[PDB]
Each structure stands twice: as structure tokens, then as C-alpha cells.
Design a protein around this ligand. Structure first.
Ligand SMILES: CN(C(=O)[C@H](Cc1cc(F)cc(F)c1)NC(=O)Cc1c[nH]c2ccc(O)cc12)c1ccc2scnc2c1
Ligand SMILES: CN(C(=O)[C@H](Cc1cc(F)cc(F)c1)NC(=O)Cc1c[nH]c2ccc(O)cc12)c1ccc2scnc2c1
Ligand SMILES: CN(C(=O)[C@H](Cc1cc(F)cc(F)c1)NC(=O)Cc1c[nH]c2ccc(O)cc12)c1ccc2scnc2c1
Ligand SMILES: CN(C(=O)[C@H](Cc1cc(F)cc(F)c1)NC(=O)Cc1c[nH]c2ccc(O)cc12)c1ccc2scnc2c1
Ligand SMILES: CN(C(=O)[C@H](Cc1cc(F)cc(F)c1)NC(=O)Cc1c[nH]c2ccc(O)cc12)c1ccc2scnc2c1
Ligand SMILES: CN(C(=O)[C@H](Cc1cc(F)cc(F)c1)NC(=O)Cc1c[nH]c2ccc(O)cc12)c1ccc2scnc2c1
Lengths: 219, 219, 219, 219, 219, 219
């Protein structure tokens, strides 16, 4: 990654064994549960493209997912190239060249080039641009590997309401509900999918109840 | 987080793998036992809003609780906006803009903006403001998930007094008793809820006994 | 805590995850065995009052003990206030104010205030003052939770002398014997509580024997 | 390794116990799965030839592989020597000498020499050159130890498509398919090797389907 | 401990959780096996008297041993006082005072005093002096807890010679043989205590055989 | 060890708990497998003689080996003294004295002396000299504890060739074959010791086959 040192300057540091191990372990334990994405983001703080590729390459399993991620990256890189075509022909001696999509993804750029872009004034934040593409791909994979529709999350007759709500919002997270549903699912589907006894109580609360109020009512 | 370096200056540092792992593990092990809150507070020392969101987002389960926390945050952010309305229209070039509630919660602000607010002279401590909202929400969740009323903590006939007192004050902590009860429960309910033999002894101690004195008397 | 940096200056640093985890684990494993106190002391090196409260608050169980500790703190804080009354009325702008007992215990003071006191020339060492109160309380709890009188530590007929002496001095430590007994128990109770065969040998050694000499004699 | 310090200068640092342990453990756990290579690369960031030899020498098992790796190194070192012959006869006093292949591999050079080459302006990056030879050898070993032809990865009649695709691309990775196959295997062999029911569906998708589309179709 | 910082100056640093944990664990696992002493010495690098007391106080069991160690310390402190009596009467304002034995052992000195002695030019190395007393005491305890005489280490008829020699020198280490025996036991008791078959072979080697030669001969 | 700090200067640092633990664990797990030597070398980067003795002394078992190592050290120290006799009689005040063999081994020198030698311009690298003696001794022990002759490593009739080659080169490593055999054993004994079926195939490959080619042929 690129870090600031103790005297305020941006320099390259090796990825730590701790970081490497943390990432491998989170993939091993959590697969593509939604919470893997914020963990990736955090563990890739300051990452170069080379570092991001390192992280992805350390994943041993989940190769269907890793191929989908490559496809996503290739699409974003192609879009980059449409928006930001570079002049061809030899680079001015000693001067920074313009990154193409493949350079952002670290396939056709050196570490030295990546460092140069990321620490330029003003910077071309190739680490952050690539990380965005990766996260886009990861979110697609999370959605793919989500096993259950929100339509199929219904409170059992002997299921505590809190347990149901846990399942409901964990499923919405994976399914990657748009903000309206996340926000309002409370008013709609959460009540509809409750068991008959809790549904009766929730209906009687009337509109605008907080989740705290609902959970209290159905305790 | 924002830390001071070795030469006395405030700069941004990535959240460490150790910090990330510690938080996930404490939620995994302790759920919303009251002691999770001081651990959150400690692990989020110097945190930006982005860091706080990272921490919250790394939680995989407990999604009912995480939705209640969002609701709490939204309420505090709305109150912020009522107390501190911002001027609309384009920002003066190069100048710090005023944070709205959504900016404090990290949904509409960049890391660079957050750093700028937190390190301004004087600072707008958006990390600490957001952390307060989060802790407010966490305390509500602790109360919610507390399973037992203090009224139902009564000393068994074969239960050592110390074991009872442990249960009593652990329950009061979760229930989030006001200071009077925490302070005085000793004089009131703790004695009332003791078993007959210990109650007889405690009654005979008369008023103002310390907890040490009570525990000695009922050993 | 407040630490010196690499250039010799006293600044605030966040409590580390390692420190936090070490403390929780020592309480989990050792409860209020006497050796918990030196571990607390060591793990709270340089601690502010805020840090000390963090450490105490991270304890999930042992709430009878934690309430006794609060009582101890309240007594010491009240004594502080009797010895060091503060002038009331508004503080001189920009100037350090005088700490009350509640400020030392971190209930009515900010982190910024605590830092200011601890790093003043000359300092008001509020961390060390509070730590002393806490340790006083912890020692009371160690004594309380000590299960066995020294009077009841007697060498079994088939018990190796070393095993007995281990039990004896572990019990004296918890019971918190005054220096005379720690020093001289060797000459008195240790011999009296030995089994008949070892007692006969120890009696014949005559006065002033070292513990090494006693242990050799009864091997 | 050679690292930059806190003031921006390139100096030698000992290989850490953490790095050493991470490498041994990855070989112990993963043998020569393809993901071992990016882990080697990452753990050898900034490595001298001496460090690289340390890493390789810490491997206790897999001695057939380690002998193949030596053979690969010897071939690359011989090629180096053909491309970059050195002048014989005594070195100018005090001056940097030119590295031979054996010097790059760390068999005939000192640590001091390696440091001198790697930190020269301009550098002779002997660590990176040697690392390339090692990675070439490691890739040969990965291919060797790959147990299964891609021709033999066929979807079972009761095997979820995702599970099949996982096996397929994990095998292609080890077999070290050229870019065309990695890229296009999707259009060819992946469909051919699918079970009859999924094959029927995939055929009907027509050309140019993304892997995401295929996986959705065969869910 | 007192350490040098990054700019070459001697300052106080808190004892780390890692150091604390390492020491407790070595006592837990190894008791008073001889190898505990070098581990103590290493973990107490740069220690103040306060740090050394911390380390000793963190030991929960082995209280017979810890009381013997106190006795040893008291003897060394008394000898210190006989060799280095201090002038009584009030200290010159602002000036370093002379340490007594109790000050070296950390019972009557502050951390500030200890730091002052250890960093004086020239220093009064109270940490190293106390550590020597402790190590003297620890060595006595190692000898005490050594269960077996070297006279009783004899090679079994079916025992490999190497296994016997392992037992022999492990016992000599604990028994704390003087240099002559350590050096020459090879020529004497090691042969005498070998089984008849190996003894016959060793006798025929004649004088001055290395241990390597003996072990080869009896393989 | 002696390390460079963050400003480029050579100073003494305590051996870390991590280093100590890593070494003990590698001896516990691996005994005197050949791979222990590179691990020793790596963990003793920058070590003083005092540090090296610390490392060796922390080993609890394997005392036959540790006595052989002492013997090796004594021989090398005696040779040092024959090659580099020192002038007797009192040292010039304030001046560096010349190390004898016992000083290099850390038995008759202080830490301060060792630091002085190692950081002199030009240095007398007593750490590296002693480490060489230790490694010489360790290699002798590895050879000693190697249980099996290369003559006895023969491919089983149902043993995969790769498994055989693993055993073969692991045995050669321990036996510490000279370079010719390591290099050429491939052409000779490896084929001779193969099972009849693989031997037939290898014979037909003719001379100069790589190990990769052999392993492919016998798959
Ligand atoms: C520069 N770069 C890389 O080193 C990527 C990084 C990467 C990207 C990703 F999206 C998923 C990953 F698991 C690993 N790694 C690989 O190509 C290695 C590999 C993994 N599984 C594989 C399965 C089959 C196979 O024949 C190779 C691989 C790279 C980076 C981005 C893209 S987009 C298309 N190709 C690339 C290549
Ligand atoms: C900027 N920001 C965030 O990245 C929050 C941070 C956060 C806040 C919180 F209160 C609880 C959490 F678990 C996570 N994270 C998420 O929205 C992701 C998520 C978790 N569970 C979910 C369940 C369903 C779903 O469709 C999304 C999520 C954010 C931060 C504060 C608020 S208040 C209303 N929305 C937001 C969004
Ligand atoms: C500022 N301050 C604190 O944050 C203390 C720190 C503390 C002190 C202590 F002695 C024991 C502890 F476990 C925790 N923490 C708590 O009050 C929280 C708590 C723990 N168990 C509880 C059981 C019941 C309950 O309703 C609250 C708590 C604080 C600090 C000192 C004193 S003395 C009287 N009250 C205070 C409060
Ligand atoms: C300088 N250098 C080294 O210290 C190499 C480093 C190395 C290289 C490698 F390709 C694989 C490894 F496991 C270890 N280590 C060894 O030779 C020790 C060894 C391991 N297994 C062995 C099996 C048999 C044997 O008689 C020795 C070894 C070295 C480095 C490169 C080459 S190429 C030909 N010889 C060398 C020697
Ligand atoms: C300043 N100082 C200390 O804090 C020593 C340090 C120490 C020294 C030692 F030799 C063994 C230890 F386990 C702990 N710790 C204790 O006295 C506490 C204690 C442990 N087991 C005990 C058993 C019974 C008891 O009533 C107290 C203790 C101290 C230090 C040196 C000496 S010599 C005589 N008394 C002292 C006291
Ligand atoms: C300065 N120095 C040391 O502290 C050595 C370091 C050392 C050297 C070594 F080759 C093997 C080791 F396990 C430990 N340690 C010991 O002597 C302690 C010891 C271990 N096992 C023993 C078995 C019996 C015994 O009566 C003592 C020991 C030292 C260092 C080098 C030599 S050569 C001859 N004597 C020495 C002494």
C-alpha cells in the first residue's frame, strides 16, 4: 500500500502478513456473505493495483466467482478506455504516461508506474478506481450467491420475532435491496411475512412504527 | 483513524487488521451484552465516520439490531439538521463546507472531507459526534436484548449471595438503571430479592451498609 | 494512555486491542486471584482515567465485585474532596481547572482535561491517583474472594511439603497478610500446620531456618 | 528485505518471524496449489537473494519440488551469464562488481554485495531478478502437481453448476491455461463439459453469454 | 523497561502485553526447568526494578518458590547495604540519592528514582543489579526442584544411547554441575552409567573421545 | 540484536518475545531436521553473542545435541585463538580490546564489549563469527540425527515416483551430500533406487534428463 510515514510523506510499503492472512481467512470463513465486502475494503486501505491483485490472487477456491469478477473488471476497464482514450506513440522521456484500463487493473502497468500515478500532484488514484471496479464485481457475486428470496423469509409459528427480523434484514442485505425497500420494507413486507399472531399486533400499531416499537410489540 | 504520528501531527491511518478482528470477535462472542459498548468505544478511538461505518458493516449477523441502529442514527442526523441548518448553493472554492447529518454519518461525505473537519482548527469532531449517535443506538439495543427484569432476579435458597449479587448487578447494567437505582438498589431491591435467611441478616444490619458488609454478612 | 513518542514528548495514544484483550482474558481466566492486580497495574501503564474506566467497563461478569469497586472509588473520591476542596465559580478563560474526586475517576472530566492534568508542568497525575483507588478496591475484592483461612491450610499426611508450602503462601497472599506474618509465618504457623512427621523434623532444625532449609529437611 | 525507513531511505531489515511463519504455514497447508505463488511473491516483498534463499530453505518437505526449482534456477542463471558476461580479473578497489547468475541466486554473493546492487543508482535489482526465476520454477511445479486435466472436469448429473464451474476454473488455473483458453473456455469447453440439462440451456443462450448469465441460466 | 528510541536516547517504556504473556506462559508450561532462567533474562531486557517485580508478581502459583526467592533477595539486599552504606539525613534538593538494597529491589524506590539511577552518567544499574539477585534465587530454585540425582541417570538396557545422554545432560543442567563435571562428566560418569554393551564399546575408544564419537560408537 | 533504527544508526535492541517463541517452537516441532538451520540463521539476524547464547539456552530438551554443540564451539574458539593470539597485559584506558575465542562465544565478554566490536569502524563481527561456529555444530547434529542412509531410500512397488523423490532428496539433505551428489544423484542413485518399472522408463530416457522429465516419465 501507499502510506504516510511518520514525517508526512506518501511512500510504498509491503503488504503485511497480517493483512494477507486476515483476507484469506475472511474468504475461507464467510465466502461471499455481504460483510466480506467492507472487510475487503478495509484490508485494502491504501492498496496499489498490484496489492489488490495480490489479495484477489491469494483466494484459492471460489474460482467461478473469481472469473465473474474478472469479467466485471474487463467491462469497467473497457468503459474507462471509452471515456479516457490515451494518445498513442512514444512517451515523452521521463514523464508520467496516461493510464489505460489495463494499467488501472495492474495487468499492463508496473508498481513504479502505479506509485507515480497515486502520488502525483494531482493524483490519478488508480488504486481507488480499481477498488471500485472490484467492489462492483464483488457486489454482483454477493447477490448471485444469496440463496433465498426475501419473499421466502416468513416468520415461523414458533419463531421469535427478533430471529425472523434477523433473517429478513440479512436476506435483504445480500439481495441488495434498493434504499426504498431497506427503508420501507418495515412498513410492507416485514409485516406481511410475520406470523399471524405478530401480524395482528403489528397491524394494530398503525403506520410509522419504528422497528424498536415493532420488536417490543411482538416480544 | 486519525492519530498523532511520532512528531506530533494529526494524520489518517488505515484501520488495522487487529482492530477489525477484535471488533468482529467481540460481537460474535458477546452479542449485545453491555460490555460490548465500552469495547466498541475503545476500538473506535480516533475513528472517522468511514471507520465507524466499516466497523458496523463488518457485523454479519444481528441485522435486526443493525436496522434499529440505522433508525437511531437517522433520528440523530435529523435532529442535527434541525439544530445546524447549512446554507445551500455552491461552496466557496477551496473552502471547508459545513457538515449535515448525513455527512457526519459518512453517507454523503468523503474521507477527505471527514479528515478536513476532524483536523480543522477548531475541529468539527464528526467522528466523535457520530460515535455518540452510534452509542445511543447501541445502548437501546442492549436494553432491548436484556432478557430478564430486575424484578425477576431473586436469590435461590441454595444460591450463594455473591452469585445472586452478580446476577443482580449484571441485570441492572443491561436494563440500564438510572443512577439512583444503581446507587441505592443496595438499600432496596437487593435486600427484598434475597432469600429468607440472608434477608433476615441484612435487615438486622440496619441502614447504610456497604455491599462489602452485606456480602460478608451473608457469606 | 499517555506515552512518550520517539522524540521525547508526552502525548495521548489509543488503548491497543492487545491491551484490551489481555485484560479481559486475565479476568476471565483468573477472576480475583491476587496475581490479577499486578497484571492490571502493568496493563494500565500510562493510563488516563478514561482508559482505566474502559478497562473496568470491559469486564462482563463479576458485577458484585465491580459494584464494591465503585463503592471504594466513591469513598476515595470523597476523601480527595475533603483534602483538596476546589474554588467554585467560573474558571479563568483558557486555564487549567482543579480536579475534584469525580474528575479523577473520569465521571465529570473530559479526555482533554485529563491529558492536560497529566502532562502539566508540574503534573496532577490523575491517572496514577485513580489507579491507586482502583487497586485499593481490587485488593479488598481479592481478600473477599479468598476462600480459605490460613488456619485451614494444613499439610496432608501424604502431601509433599512443597505442595503444602505452595498452598500456604498462595493463601497468605490472598488473605493479604501483614508483612510480619508473611516474613515470620515461616517461624510459626507454617511449622504448626505441617504434618506430624515434618513438624518433628522442623522443630529439630531450631530457630532461624530458611525456607530452603525447611523444604530440604522435609523432602 | 530492503525497506524504506520513516525518513525515506533504503536500508536492510531482518526478515520477520511473522513473515517466516506465514510462508512455512502456507506451504504446509496448500502445498503447490496455484495460490501459493502470489503468497510467495507478497511475503518476499523487498527480499534480497539471501532472504529468498532463507524462504526456500525453510521448506522441510516437498524436496522433489525444491530440486526441480534448483534446476530451473540453474538454467536461468546460465542464461543470465550468456546475456551478461562479466569481465574477469581483479575488481577496481572499492567499486561495485558486476553480478553473475550465481551472485543473483545468492550462492556466490554476500549480503553486503546484494544490498549494494539493489540500492545502487541505478540499481541492479538482483532480488527481483532472482524472484522472477523462482516464480518461473514455482509455476512449473504448480503445473506438475496439478492432478487433473481440464478434459476430465465434467459436471455431475446432481452437481450444482456453480460447483462445477469452481472445479473447472480451479483446474484451468493449475494447468496454467494460456489467456485464450482462460478467456474463451467459457464459450467452448465449459459448455461441452456441462451435464446434459445445463448444456441444453447454455446452448440456447447463444454466443457471447457472460459467466454470470450462464450461472443464472443453470441455477 | 528503559529502551533507546529511534533517535538514540534512553527512556522508559511500558512493559508490553506480549512480554507479560510470554513470561506467564513460560512459568505455566515449564515451572522451574533450567531453561526458564534464560527466558526470564531475555524477557527482562532493559527492565527497571518495578518491571522485575511486575514479572515476579504475575506468577500465580509456585508460591513456595516465590517465598524462597524473596529470602534470597533479602540476603543480597543486606549484603549490598553492608558493602555500600548510605549517608543518612536529608537529600540535597534536586539531587540523586544513593540506592539502598530495598531501593534496588524496588520496595522503597519510585519508578522515577529507578529511571534516574539507570540513566545517570555514569549509571547505577539498579535493574541489572536486581536481576542478578533474582537469577541467583531462581538458580537455587531450579536446583531444589530438580527431582533426580545424576547418580540415578543410568542407561536402560533397551534405551538408545542418545536418549540416555539427553537425560544425563538435562539432569546435570538442573543439578547445576560445576564446569569441571559438565566438561569432564563425559570422561567419567557418562561412561560409568552407560549400559553394559555401550560401556564396553566406550571403554575401548580410549581417552579423549568427543561426545560425537561416543554417540556414533553406541549407535 | 544490533539493528539500524529509523535514522540510519546501529544500536542494540532487546530480543523480541516473538523471536524467542519462534525459535523454541521450531526446535519443539522439528528437532534437528535440516530446515531448522535456516530458521536459526534467520531468527538470529543481527544477533550479538549474548543473543545467540540466549537462543541456545532457551532449548530445554536435546541436551546431547547441545553438549555436542558446545564441543564444536570450543574447538572453533581454540582455532580462533591459534590464528589470532592477543597481547596480554592491561588494556589501554578507554580502548577496544581484542576478542579471544571465549569472547566471541560470549562466555568472557560483556554485552557492551560485543556491541563495541560489532559496531566498530571497521567492525569485528563477533556475532557473525560465533553464528558460523554454531551453524557448523548444528550441521554436525543434523547429520548425526539423520536416521536413514541414502542407500536405503528405494522406491516401493506401489509408491508414486514423486513420493520416492521427496524421500530421496530429504534424506540427501540431512546426510549433507557434497554438491556433486546433490547435483548428479539424479543421474546415478536416484535411477538405481527406483522400482523396476520406473527404472526401465528412466533408463530409456538416456543421459541428461531433468528431474521434471524423469518425474513426468514415471507419472
Ligand atoms: C493481473 N491480474 C491478475 O493477477 C489476476 C487478479 C485477479 C482478478 C480477478 F478478477 C479475480 C482473481 F481471482 C484474480 N489473477 C489472475 O488472473 C490469476 C488467476 C486467478 N484465478 C485464475 C483462474 C484461471 C487462470 O488461468 C488464472 C487465474 C488480472 C487483474 C485483472 C484482470 S481482469 C482479467 N484478467 C485480469 C488479470
Ligand atoms: C454509509 N452507511 C453504511 O455504510 C451503513 C453503516 C451501518 C449503519 C448501521 F446503523 C448499522 C450497520 F450495520 C451498518 N451500512 C449499510 O447500510 C450496509 C448494511 C448493513 N446491514 C444491511 C442490511 C440491509 C441493507 O440493504 C444494507 C445493510 C450508513 C451509515 C449510517 C446510516 S443511517 C441509515 N443508513 C445508513 C447508512
Ligand atoms: C465513569 N464510570 C464508569 O464508566 C464506570 C467504570 C467502572 C467503575 C468500577 F468501579 C467498576 C466498573 F465495572 C466500572 N462504569 C460503569 O458505571 C458501568 C457499569 C459497570 N457495571 C455496571 C452495573 C450496573 C450499572 O448500572 C452500570 C455499570 C465510573 C467510574 C467510577 C465510578 S465510582 C461510581 N460510579 C463510577 C462510574
Ligand atoms: C544458496 N542456495 C541455497 O541456500 C539453496 C536455496 C534453495 C533453492 C531452491 F531452488 C530450492 C530450495 F529448497 C532451496 N538451499 C539449498 O541448497 C539447501 C537444500 C534444500 N534442499 C536440499 C536438498 C539436498 C541438499 O543437499 C541441499 C538442499 C542456492 C540457491 C539457488 C540454487 S540453484 C542450485 N543450487 C542452489 C543453491
Ligand atoms: C516490592 N516487592 C514486590 O512487589 C514482590 C515482588 C516479588 C518478589 C519475589 F521474590 C517473589 C515474588 F513472587 C514477588 N511481590 C510481593 O511481595 C507480592 C507477593 C507475591 N507472593 C506473595 C505471597 C504472600 C504475600 O503476602 C505477598 C506476596 C518485593 C520485592 C522484593 C522483595 S524481597 C522481600 N519482599 C520483597 C517484595
Ligand atoms: C556462555 N555460554 C552459555 O550460556 C551456554 C550457551 C549454549 C551453548 C551451546 F553450545 C549449547 C547450549 F545449549 C547453550 N549455555 C550453557 O552452558 C547452559 C547449559 C545448557 N545446557 C547445559 C547442560 C549442562 C550444564 O551444566 C549447562 C548447560 C556458553 C557458550 C558457548 C560455550 S562452548 C562451552 N561452553 C559454553 C558456554
Amino acid at each position: 500500500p501507499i502510506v504516510q510515514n511518520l514525517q508526512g510523506q506518501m511512500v510504498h510499503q509491503c503488504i503485511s502478513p497480517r493483512t494477507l492472512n486476515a483476507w484469506v481467512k475472511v474468504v475461507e470463513e464467510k465466502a461471499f456473505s455481504p460483510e466480506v465486502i467492507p472487510m475487503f475494503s478495509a484490508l485494502s486501505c491504501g492498496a496499489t493495483p498490484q496489492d489488490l491483485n495480490t489479495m484477489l490472487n491469494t483466494v484459492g477456491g471460489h474460482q467461478a466467482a473469481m472469473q465473474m469478477l474478472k469479467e466485471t473488471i474487463n467491462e469497467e476497464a473497457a468503459e474507462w478506455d471509452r471515456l479516457h482514450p490515451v494518445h498513442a506513440g512514444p512517451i515523452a522521456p521521463g514523464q508520467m504516461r496516461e493510464p489505460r484500463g489495463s494499467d488501472i487493473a495492474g495487468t499492463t502497468s508496473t508498481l513504479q508506474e502505479q506509485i507515480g500515478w497515486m502520488t502525483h500532484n494531482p493524483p490519478i488514484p488508480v488504486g481507488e478506481i480499481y477498488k471500485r471496479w472490484i467492489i462492483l464485481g464483488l457486489n454482483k457475486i454477493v447477490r448471485m450467491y444469496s440463496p433465498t428470496s426475501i419473499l421466502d423469509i416468513r416468520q415461523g409459528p414458533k419463531e421469535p420475532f427478533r430471529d425472523y427480523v434477523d433473517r429478513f434484514y440479512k436476506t435483504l442485505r445480500a439481495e441488495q435491496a434498493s434504499q426504498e425497500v431497506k427503508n420501507a420494507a418495515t412498513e410492507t413486507l416485514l409485516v406481511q411475512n410475520a406470523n399471524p399472531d405478530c401480524k395482528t399486533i403489528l397491524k394494530a400499531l398503525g403506520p410509522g412504527a419504528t422497528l424498536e416499537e415493532m420488536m417490543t410489540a411482538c416480544q
